[PDB]
């Protein structure tokens, strides 16, 4: 009843990742004067002001100066920003009366319907801002004489444990809910990021915790739990080398209870490397799923991208799975594939070519797309399928005349 183990292997090996960080309050960072963006400077400032707070509490007049100067800029920026809110409110009360501003209705594409039959239901007053964002969720086949949207997706994002805009624990949450009198869909995801050190206080060392849950009634009558803990550090082999490891646990709770049901355990690695003129990004994973009744099933997956200096326009990627079903001594089931892309410009048009190789069935798939924004010189190949249709028309018109 659990998903196939290739789903877990694909999910645990998808490239070199990068976690969520700290966001800075722009008026207090770079006190008063305008700033620019740089990751190391913001990451330095967030840990620097916590350190200066601890030293200022302990005594230390040089830290007290810095923390008081930050407090002065913080107060000035906050009062300026509430003044901007008051000015915007007065301007809105002048431009409209006691009336409100109204959104655009959603565009669902063409239909055999008058297309403003239900457009008055998606034009509403704004509310402006409350913290969360909502989008409607739509199905593939809607009802015939109505709008197709059925569910609501909520999104929230915050940074709770900060002192004065020097944050702690980036956090976000996403819930999809569809409720009616027949069914119930409830999906959810949460991420929490924890930062251990940034340079020059250390190297960049960040862990990330992800949780997710799946409820779908009355189809499944079991719920799905996943938990991922994964850790990244820049280094471990050389300067600025983005390494990371991680583990994943998953369960199908029977009746909703997370203490009973089949389980899945997996681990993953990522790395980058630069040797010669070849830069490579690789990741690998192993999953040890439990079956419904059969027991251990294990799988291996790996992905690689080989960047190349010379010929900087050729992209090439390689992928591998290995399957180990029971009777493991003679059921090793391999699979590997290759992918190449390139890109030209000719005849006033932009060409892109993609070559794909699956290597189990020895098939080569080539796909070229072109785009001419200048003329219709690219249509000379359109004479190729137009001939054969005629050869399938007269041959029909002969057989329809017999």
């Amino acid at each position: 009843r659990l998903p196939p183990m290739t789903f877990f292997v694909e999910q645990m090996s998808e490239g070199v990742l990068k976690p969520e960080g700290w966001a800075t309050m722009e008026t207090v960072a770079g006190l008063g004067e305008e700033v620019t963006e740089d990751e190391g400077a913001e990451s330095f400032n967030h840990v620097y002001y916590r350190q200066m707070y601890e030293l200022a509490v302990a005594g230390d007049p040089w830290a007290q100066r810095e923390y008081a100067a930050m407090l002065r800029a913080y107060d000035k920026g906050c009062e300026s920003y509430r003044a901007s809110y008051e000015e915007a409110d007065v301007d809105a009360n002048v431009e409209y009366g006691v009336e409100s501003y109204v959104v655009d209705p959603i565009d669902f594409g063409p239909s055999f319907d008058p297309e403003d039959m239900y457009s008055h239901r998606h034009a509403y007053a704004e509310a402006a801002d409350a913290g969360v964002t909502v989008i409607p969720s739509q199905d593939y086949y809607g009802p015939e004489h109505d709008d197709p949207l059925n569910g609501i997706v909520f999104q929230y994002e915050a940074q709770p444990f900060s002192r004065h805009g020097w944050g702690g624990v980036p956090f976000d949450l996403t819930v999809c809910c569809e409720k009616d009198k027949t069914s119930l869909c409830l999906q959810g995801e949460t991420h929490v990021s924890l930062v251990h050190s940034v340079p020059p206080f250390g190297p960049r060392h960040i862990t990330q915790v992800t949780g997710s849950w799946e409820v779908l009634r009355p189809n499944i009558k079991d719920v799905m739990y996943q938990l991922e803990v994964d850790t990244f550090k820049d280094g471990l082999l050389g300067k600025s080398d983005h390494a990371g490891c991680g583990l994943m646990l998953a369960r199908l709770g029977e009746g909703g209870d997370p203490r009973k049901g089949p389980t899945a355990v997996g681990v993953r690695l990522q790395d980058t490397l630069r040797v010669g003129p070849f830069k490579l990004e690789a990741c690998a994973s192993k999953v040890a799923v439990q079956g419904p009744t059969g027991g251990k099933e294990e799988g291996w997956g790996a992905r690689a991208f080989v960047g190349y200096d010379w010929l900087p326009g050729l992209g090439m990627a390689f992928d591998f799975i290995q399957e180990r079903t029971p009777e493991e001594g003679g059921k090793r089931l391999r699979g590997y594939g290759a992918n190449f892309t390139y890109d030209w410009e000719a005849l006033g048009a932009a060409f892109g070519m993609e070559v794909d190789y699956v290597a189990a069935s020895e098939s080569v798939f080539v796909s070229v797309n072109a785009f001419s924004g200048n003329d219709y010189r690219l249509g000379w190949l359109l004479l190729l399928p137009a001939v054969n249709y005629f050869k399938e028309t007269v041959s029909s018109l002969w057989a329809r005349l017999r």
Partner: peptide, 18 residues
């Protein structure tokens, strides 16, 4: 094999710092 021991080589050397 490969992604059990070397999946703990990275875990042990990340524990070696913190």
């Amino acid at each position: 094999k490969f992604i059990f021991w070397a999946a703990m080589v990275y875990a042990t050397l990340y524990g070696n710092y913190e």
